[PDB]
Amino acid sequence: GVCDGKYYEKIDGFLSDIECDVLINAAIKKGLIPKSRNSEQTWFMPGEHEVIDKIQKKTREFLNSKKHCIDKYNFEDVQVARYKPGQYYYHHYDGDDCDDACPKDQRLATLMVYLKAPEEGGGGETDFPTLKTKIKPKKGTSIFFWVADPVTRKLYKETLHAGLPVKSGEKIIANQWIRAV
């Protein structure tokens, strides 16, 4: 079963408000501005930015409380993504659906930080439909969730998720994916 039965965990104040703004501005300087993904994205190199460094440090410290669930992993380069009104990410898994040929570098988990939330009544929730829960974006809050089993690398299909449409304002996230070795 999933690590301690906790398919997702939410952490408020994972980044400070001014750390989120510094990261948004760095992403804008890099050019950030029916089914699947309808958003803009950019990628950060390892060590490119001190706020990325902090995401990865706190993610590692978090995973250190889960040593009985996960041994070796790698951090993917961090992605920052933006949603304008009308933009959304249709439901999907963050890893490869597999049984007997699971990739050796399968994504095992996701740590996603909300850098900027929609306006009041602005939609843009993160939906986990199988778990019957939707998380409302809040600046600085992180959502951690399990994507695949570290032993078999098969998906936890319980964490099917989506970014719902933004109705007003904008939504900016940072994705830290955790990969098998």
Ligand X SMILES: O=C(O)CCC(=O)C(=O)O
Which residues of this protein are in contact with Mn ion, per CB under 5 A? 4
Shortest separation between residue 92's beta carbon and Zn ion, angstroms: 6
Integer CA distances (angstroms), 53 to 5, 33, 60, in order: 29, 23, 11
Shortest distance, position 50 Cβ to Zn ion, whole Å: 26
Q: Is 83 annotated as a binding residue?
A: yes
The 83-112 contact track toward Zn ion, x by CB under 5 A, reads -----------x------------------
The β-bridge partners of 92 are 161
> Is 161 annotated for ligand binding?
yes
- Which is closer to ligand X, CB of 26 or CB of 109? 109
* DSSP secondary structure of 118-178: --TT-B-PEEEGGGTEEEPP-TT-EEEEE-B-TTT--B-GGG-EEEPPB-SS-EEEEEEEE
**91 is an annotated ligand-binding site residue:** no
Tokens of 145: 């969730």
Binding site for ligand X (CB under 6 A): 81, 89, 94, 126, 161, 163, 173, 175
**Binding site: which residues?**
4, 68, 83, 92, 94, 126, 161, 171, 175
